[PDB]
Amino acid sequence: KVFERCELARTLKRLGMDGYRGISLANWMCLAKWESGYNTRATNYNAGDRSTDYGIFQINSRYWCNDGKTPGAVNACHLSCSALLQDNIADAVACAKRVVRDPQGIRAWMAWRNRCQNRDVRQYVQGCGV
Numbered sequence: 001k002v003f004e005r006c007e008l009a010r011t012l013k014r015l016g017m018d019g020y021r022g023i024s025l026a027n028w029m030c031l032a033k034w035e036s037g038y039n040t041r042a043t044n045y046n047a048g049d050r051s052t053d054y055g056i057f058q059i060n061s062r063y064w065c066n067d068g069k070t071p072g073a074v075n076a077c078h079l080s081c082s083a084l085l086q087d088n089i090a091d092a093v094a095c096a097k098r099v100v101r102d103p104q105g106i107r108a109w110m111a112w113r114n115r116c117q118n119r120d121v122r123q124y125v126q127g128c129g130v
Contacts, residue, residue, distance in 0.1 A: 001087040003038040003056075005029070006128035013130045015093045021100045028096075029124035030116040031109055032056050040087055054084035055092045057099075057109070064095055 003011070009029055012018070018025040035058040036042035044053040051062035051070045059065060062073040065081035077095035084092050099108050106112050 001040050003032075003040075005038070005124070006130075008032060008038050008056075009125050009128040009130045011089065012093065015090060017093060017097075018130070020097055021105060023100060023106050024121075025130055026121040026124045027106055027112070027116060030119075030121045031106065031112045033124065034111045034115045035109065040089060040092070041085060043085070052081065054081045056089055057092055057096045059084055059092070059095055059099065064099065 009025060012028055012032075013025055017023075017028050032038055035053075036056050038056060040056045042053070042055060042058060044058060046052065046060075049062065049071075051060055051073060052067060053060055054065060054067075059077070061067045061070045061081050064075070064077045065079045065084055066073070066075040067081040077098050079091055079095055084095065086092075100106055102108060107117075
């Protein structure tokens with residue numbers, strides 16, 4: 001599914017994302033926006049290293065989930081990458097939380113650094129009632 005801005009913001013807040021490891025809701029919203037456009041079906045193959053990005057946060061199969069086809073990958077979230085493709089984002093959110101429990105935090109996703117870091121991100125949650 002493709003979430004509408006405010007619908008996603010409320011869902012994320014309900015799932016415990018606001019301030020998780022000090023990351024504001026607007027940062028998660030900015031990330032989800034730039035990673036997939038709020039699309040839980042989004043997939044991206046990386047021909048250069050044979051891994052795929054799955055879901056709304058485009059979590060990588062080489063490190064976070066298992067798709068069985070990625071060369072010498074790991075499964076930190078201990079989830080099938082298929083779970084990262086459900087309309088229900090609870091599993092994806094749980095994985096995004098695991099990802100930020102590492103030292104880098106939300107800096108783990110390079111697009112966040114490029115499109116979100118040190119910017120005014122209030123616009124992603126304005127009017128949403130969050």
